[PDB]
UniProtKB/Swiss-Prot annotation, chain C:
The keyword Transmembrane applies. PROSITE patterns: FLAP_GST2_LTC4S. PANTHER family: MICROSOMAL GLUTATHIONE S-TRANSFERASE, MICROSOMAL GLUTATHIONE S-TRANSFERASE 2. It is found in: Endoplasmic reticulum membrane; Microsome membrane. This is Microsomal glutathione S-transferase 2.
C-alpha cells in the first residue's frame, strides 16, 4: 500500500548516486584534486548541478510521500516519475552550459509545487475525517 | 493516519526550504553572480551559506521529527516542529543581514532538534525493551 | 514494527550532527570566517568530507527503510550499522589526508548498493503477488 512510492523512491535514489558518480568522473577528467571544488569551468558546472539536485532531494521525497499517502498513490507516483525526468534534463543541460539548465529546472519545480498542493489538500481533507467530513 | 500532524508540519517545512532556495535565486540576480560560481558578493555569500546550512540539516530534522512523533508523542513533536520552523526563519533572515545576527535562530532551532532527538531515543528505547526483552 | 530502523536512523542523525560540529570547530581552529569555506587546506578537507556525508544521508535513509520494510528489518538494520561505521572511517580518514578516505568510502558505498538491491527485490517480490 506504499509499493508504488517505494519504487519511485528507489529510482530517484539511483539517479542521485549516478550524479555523484559523474562528479567523481569529472574530478579525474579535469584534474580537480580533493578537497578542491573549483579550477575547471566544466567541473564547476557539473559539481553545482549535482549540489542543487542533492539539496532538493529530501524535499522531493517528503512531498512525494505526503501526496501519495494523503491524496492518491498512483497520481503522485506519476508526477514523481516526471520530476525524475525534469532533473535529468537539468543536470545534463547545466553540464553543457549554465543557460541550458532552465527547462529541466522549471519542469521539476512545477511538479514539486503541484505535489505540495496535492499533499496539502489531502492532509486537510484527511484532517476533517476526525471531524467526520469527507469532501 | 495517526501521522496527519507530522505530515502537515513536514509539508510546511518543505515549503520553507523551497522559499530559501528562491531567495538564493533572487540574490544571484541582484548581485550578478554568474553560475556556477557562489562567491564574489558578500551579501550573496551570506544568503548562500545560510540556505546551505538549512538544507544540510533538513533531513536530520525530518528523521528526528518522525521518530519523536511515532515513538513518543505526535502532538508534542508536532509543536516542537513548528517552533523549529520558526527558529530557521530567524536564522536565515538573521544571517542575511549580518553573520552574527544568525545566532538567536541558530540556538533555538538546534535546542529543539536536540530535544526531539532525546524524545525519539527514549521512545525507541522504551519500545525496544518492550519488544525484544519484555520490559516496559 | 520499525523499532530497529528507528534506532539506526536516530544513531545516524547523531553522527551527522557530530560531523557538523567538527566543521564548526574547524572554523575556529583555522580562522575561516563565515560565509567563506576556503583558505585552510585542512579545513577544506573537513568541510568537503562533511558535505559528502550530508549529501548521501537522505539516500541512505530511504534505502534503509525500503529494505527494512520490504525485505527484512533485522538484516537491513545490520547493514545500516556497518554503513554508519564506514562513514566514520571516511570522515576521519579524509580529515587527515584525501587518500585516507578511500576505505570508508568503499565500505559505505558497498552497503548502500546492497540496501538498494534488497529494497528493489523485496518491492518486486512484493509486487509479484499483487
Amino acid at each position: 500500500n506504499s509499493i508504488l512510492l517505494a519504487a519511485v523512491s528507489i529510482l530517484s535514489a539511483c539517479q542521485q548516486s549516478y550524479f555523484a558518480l559523474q562528479v567523481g568522473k569529472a574530478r579525474l577528467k579535469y584534474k580537480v584534486t580533493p578537497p578542491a571544488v573549483t579550477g575547471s569551468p566544466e567541473f564547476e558546472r557539473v559539481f553545482r548541478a549535482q549540489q542543487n539536485c542533492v539539496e532538493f532531494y529530501p524535499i522531493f521525497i517528503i512531498t512525494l510521500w505526503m501526496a501519495g499517502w494523503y491524496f492518491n498513490q498512483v497520481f503522485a507516483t506519476c508526477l514523481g516519475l516526471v520530476y525524475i525526468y525534469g532533473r535529468h534534463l537539468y543536470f545534463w543541460g547545466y553540464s553543457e552550459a549554465a543557460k541550458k539548465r532552465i527547462t529541466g529546472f522549471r519542469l521539476s519545480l512545477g511538479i514539486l509545487a503541484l505535489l505540495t498542493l496535492l499533499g496539502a489538500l489531502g492532509i486537510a481533507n484527511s484532517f476533517l475525517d476526525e471531524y467526520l467530513d469527507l469532501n
